[PDB]
């Protein structure tokens, strides 16, 4: 039919707006670095907040003792505990428990959120076993990972700037996040002190360097996206105090808020942001992150189902529901290799509520997944490239000389579990770097590395007891 040429025009504008030629990706990485300079000088209306984390020393390995850690969590939260042995023994024992965050606790009362996470910590310590030991009359200490933007005022205190990725809890914005948790921990009859609070990009970087000395940055790709690196304290113009002893400082970029006119956006991105929980915010993240990838696919499939009767001569009701197509669903369809795409189609049945799909519709669906995941994974690589160019690792030494070994720790379910996304991320990064430079960059997987990373930073910041 013509219905066919109508569908072709839609897919063409998608592959036209989503187009990310390497040349454009270079300009975006350039813009990323200009925005990093902007945030470190505290330019007003800076997208990149570039927040001082007060982490001036990443873990050395001489960490010793018993420390707990709390990690929250865009979709989950975990309570961790480890007995750190020292330079030689290291981590002796380690236990953990992950709990899924109930959907209401993301949009309710902050007392409800922190009461829930503190009551799960309560029963977790109460099960403290035998290979963990706290010296007599000492107080247990907590490393707290907070995956949302926070304005830091010390290693263990900070103001919530805004909420992201699904959360919308009134009353916390502007309040100390550790004081809020501490209270809830008291309301639970629990004796614990939080000695280090850190983003989750900062936490992974800490836990990342504990097992690999060359880790220079950490990138998160889960329900949200963000990145942290180590910077030179002289390269931050808004620093006011007296420089750290190590001359280094970990910066939480909060790069999900990056916006640029070089970003390849479309009407599907405009509508998504318009109907979002935080409209206008987190523009970059809403093209990369797991919370938004499937939703972009659903909105493209919706244009096609309507302007092209792709799934029938009546748009399916389920397709009009926002966030009905989740990114792991998108992921499953994308990796279908069967000749007739029976597993993509079996997924479409559940999500659309249609009864069958044509083989052409399946192929169009598979192409939409490809275009959306590609744009996200390429732009994410362009961001990592920008970090490497901030640290001056986008190039090899001309001495000619030795080669640096630069490791970037990666964490999050999108990167860990979306295969194509992962290989497209790494291919583009190697493409963005030279063949020469790419042989010096390592993308390590440090799943949930903020859990222990926060406990390690709690160790170096003990009381001691
Ligand atoms: N199989 C998958 N394919 C694609 N994305 C996935 C998959 N599994 C999980 N994800 C993404 O990872 C996110 C979970 O990652 P995670 O790091 O564990 O938590 P957080 O929600 O804190 O970011 C999910 O929101 C989802 O968007
Ligand atoms: O989850 C990784 C990142 O996702 C972003 O949406 C949040 O603003 C960050 O606080 C977080 O570190
Ligand atoms: Mg996980």
């Amino acid at each position: 039919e013509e219905r066919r040429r109508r569908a072709a025009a839609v897919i063409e504008e998608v592959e036209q707006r989503f187009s990310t030629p390497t040349a454009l990706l270079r300009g975006i990485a350039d813009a990323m670095v200009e925005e990093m300079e902007r945030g470190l000088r505290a330019d007003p209306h800076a997208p990149l907040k570039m927040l001082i984390s007060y982490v001036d020393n990443l873990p050395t390995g001489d960490e010793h003792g018993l420390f707990y850690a709390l990690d929250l969590g865009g979709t989950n939260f975990r309570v961790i505990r480890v007995q750190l042995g020292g330079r030689e023994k290291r981590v002796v024992s380690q236990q953990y428990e992950e709990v899924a965050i109930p959907p209401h606790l993301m949009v309710g009362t902050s007392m409800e959120l922190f009461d829930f996470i503190a009551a799960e910590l309560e029963s977790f310590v109460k099960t403290e076993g035998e290979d963990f030991h706290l010296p007599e009359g000492r107080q247990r200490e907590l490393g707290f990972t907070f995956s949302f933007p926070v304005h830091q005022t010390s290693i263990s205190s900070g103001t919530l700037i805004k909420w992201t990725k699904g959360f919308s809890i009134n009353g916390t914005v502007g309040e100390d996040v550790v004081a809020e948790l501490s209270r809830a921990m008291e309301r639970q009859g629990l004796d614990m002190k939080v000695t280090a609070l850190v983003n989750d990009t900062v936490g992974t970087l800490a836990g990342g360097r504990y097992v690999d000395n060359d880790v220079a940055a950490a990138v998160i790709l889960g329900t949200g996206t963000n990145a942290a690196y180590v910077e030179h304290a002289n390269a931050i113009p808004k620093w006011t105090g007296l420089l750290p002893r190590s001359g280094n400082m970990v910066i939480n970029m909060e790069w999900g808020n990056f916006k640029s006119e070089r970003l390849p956006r479309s009407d599907y991105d405009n509508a998504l942001d318009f109907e979002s929980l935080n409209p206008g915010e987190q523009i970059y993240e809403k093209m990369i992150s797991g919370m938004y990838l499937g939703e972009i696919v659903r909105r493209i499939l919706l244009k096609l189902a309507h302007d092209a009767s792709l799934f029938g001569d009546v748009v399916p009701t389920k397709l009009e529901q926002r966030f009905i197509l989740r990114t792991p669903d998108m992921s499953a369809m994308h990796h279908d290799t069967s000749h007739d795409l029976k597993h993509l189609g079996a997924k479409l049945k559940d999500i659309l509520g249609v009864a069958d799909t044509s083989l052409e519709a399946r192929y169009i669906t598979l192409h939409v997944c490809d275009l959306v995941a590609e744009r996200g994974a390429r732009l994410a690589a362009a961001g990592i490239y920008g970090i490497l160019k901030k640290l001056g690792r986008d190039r090899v030494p001309s001495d000619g000389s030795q080669k640096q070994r630069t490791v970037i720790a990666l964490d999050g379910g999108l990167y860990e579990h979306y295969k194509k996304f992962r290989t497209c991320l790494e291919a583009t990064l190697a493409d963005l770097l030279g063949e020469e430079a790419a042989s010096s960059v390592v993308v390590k997987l440090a799943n949930d590395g903020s859990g222990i990373g926060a406990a390690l930073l709690a160790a170096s910041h003990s009381q001691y007891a």
Side-chain angles (χ1 to χ4, degrees):
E1 286 237 329
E2 161 232 20
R3 88 137 196 89
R4 167 107 82 286
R5 63 76 147 186
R6 195 106 138 83
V10 171
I11 298 174
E12 196 181 283
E13 202 190 24
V14 169
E15 6 174 73
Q16 171 142 66
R17 337 301 300 135
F18 286 50
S19 180
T20 59
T22 295
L24 179 59
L25 292 192
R26 295 214 189 256
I28 291 183
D30 280 359
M32 184 69 77
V33 178
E34 297 162 27
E35 293 296 339
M36 298 172 75
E37 309 279 24
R38 231 138 104 38
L40 296 165
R41 40 172 189 259
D43 240 34
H45 303 345
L48 290 233
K49 288 307 228 199
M50 307 294 288
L51 326 152
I52 312 285
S53 23
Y54 283 73
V55 176
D56 53 338
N57 292 312
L58 286 182
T60 46
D62 311 335
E63 279 87 356
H64 169 260
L66 174 271
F67 297 91
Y68 283 76
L70 176 63
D71 206 355
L72 168 88
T75 307
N76 74 347
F77 79 97
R78 30 168 62 210
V79 275
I80 304 116
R81 155 228 287 165
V82 303
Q83 192 73 48
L84 297 185
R87 166 182 291 190
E88 309 291 7
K89 275 256 111 194
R90 293 207 134 209
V91 49
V92 174
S93 294
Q94 177 184 355
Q95 289 199 292
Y96 85 74
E97 218 90 39
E98 212 214 73
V99 180
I101 299 172
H104 168 73
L105 294 189
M106 309 177 181
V107 289
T109 281
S110 98
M111 227 205 34
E112 306 186 73
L113 177 53
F114 289 100
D115 266 6
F116 200 85
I117 65 181
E120 167 77 22
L121 218 175
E122 153 86 37
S123 349
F124 178 65
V125 338
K126 244 133 210 45
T127 76
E128 206 190 77
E130 273 75 56
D131 357 57
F132 288 102
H133 21 279
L134 205 240
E136 271 177 345
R138 263 165 158 232
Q139 192 183 28
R140 281 165 217 271
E141 287 159 320
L142 188 60
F144 180 29
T145 293
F146 202 69
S147 342
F148 305 90
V150 156
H151 178 254
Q152 214 88 17
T153 50
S154 75
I155 193 59
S156 54
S157 64
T159 280
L160 174 73
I161 299 182
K162 71 167 168 205
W163 287 105
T164 53
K165 87 233 187 209
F167 285 68
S168 202
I169 296 171
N170 289 7
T172 26
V173 168
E175 309 277 306
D176 212 73
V177 297
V178 177
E180 198 76 55
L181 168 64
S182 316
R183 239 115 56 175
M185 243 162 179
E186 252 145 40
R187 301 194 299 255
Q188 208 73 36
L190 221 185
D191 214 13
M192 278 216 143
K193 204 215 210 274
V194 188
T195 59
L197 144 94
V198 300
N199 187 247
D200 86 292
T201 37
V202 178
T204 292
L205 173 50
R209 184 159 282 187
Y210 191 62
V211 300
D212 191 326
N213 212 147
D214 292 319
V215 179
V219 175
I220 304 285
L221 284 162
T223 306
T225 183
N226 189 11
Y229 70 111
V230 186
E231 178 80 273
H232 290 310
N234 24 306
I236 311 184
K238 37 159 194 208
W239 189 276
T240 35
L242 65 178
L243 252 56
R245 25 289 203 203
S246 57
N248 302 305
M249 177 64 353
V250 174
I251 293 298
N252 172 14
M253 299 185 54
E254 284 294 331
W255 77 6
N257 205 68
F258 170 76
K259 16 160 146 183
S260 189
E261 298 287 315
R262 280 174 201 198
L263 285 194
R265 285 172 43 91
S266 67
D267 292 338
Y268 309 97
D269 300 295
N270 287 332
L272 185 155
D273 184 33
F274 180 95
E275 315 186 52
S276 72
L277 218 61
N278 57 339
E281 313 296 296
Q282 309 263 319
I283 289 312
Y284 184 68
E285 175 180 82
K286 289 168 179 173
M287 311 183 238
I288 323 292
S289 152
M291 175 178 178
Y292 309 104
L293 279 182
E295 177 70 5
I296 303 173
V297 176
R298 184 196 74 70
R299 293 179 174 269
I300 298 176
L301 295 182
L302 182 56
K303 180 81 173 172
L304 294 168
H306 182 294
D307 279 22
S309 300
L310 184 63
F311 300 107
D313 293 71
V314 332
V315 185
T317 295
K318 252 211 172 187
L319 182 56
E320 285 168 294
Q321 185 158 348
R322 302 191 308 118
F323 296 100
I324 195 76
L325 193 345
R326 315 133 56 213
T327 293
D329 292 326
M330 168 185 187
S331 185
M333 302 176 178
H334 199 180
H335 291 109
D336 197 351
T337 46
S338 65
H339 73 283
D340 56 326
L341 294 172
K342 69 166 80 85
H343 303 91
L344 183 152
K347 217 34 129 192
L348 274 183
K349 242 129 78 183
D350 268 344
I351 301 174
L352 303 192
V354 282
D356 219 322
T357 5
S358 64
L359 185 55
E360 172 159 29
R362 271 128 164 212
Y363 264 101
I364 294 176
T365 294
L366 182 108
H367 184 50
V368 172
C369 294
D370 204 52
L371 295 172
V372 169
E374 181 186 59
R375 209 256 242 118
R378 291 203 117 218
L379 291 174
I384 299 183
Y385 190 48
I387 299 180
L388 291 172
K389 332 177 64 183
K390 186 84 180 36
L391 310 192
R393 322 269 204 142
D394 59 316
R395 38 166 97 304
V396 196
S398 203
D399 291 349
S401 175
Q402 335 212 297
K403 213 186 38 170
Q404 344 70 282
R405 197 189 86 132
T406 312
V407 178
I408 298 150
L410 267 81
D411 176 24
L414 171 83
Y415 174 85
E416 204 191 4
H417 299 329
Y418 200 153
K419 203 149 58 235
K420 308 210 144 198
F421 190 93
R422 178 186 342 123
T423 65
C424 173
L425 187 282
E426 295 163 336
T428 315
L429 183 64
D431 184 21
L432 278 177
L433 298 162
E435 163 198 291
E436 219 176 42
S439 59
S440 74
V441 174
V442 173
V443 172
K444 243 200 43 227
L445 177 98
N447 197 50
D448 287 298
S450 40
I452 200 188
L456 293 161
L457 293 172
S460 37
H461 280 95
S462 189
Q463 314 207 248
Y464 303 134

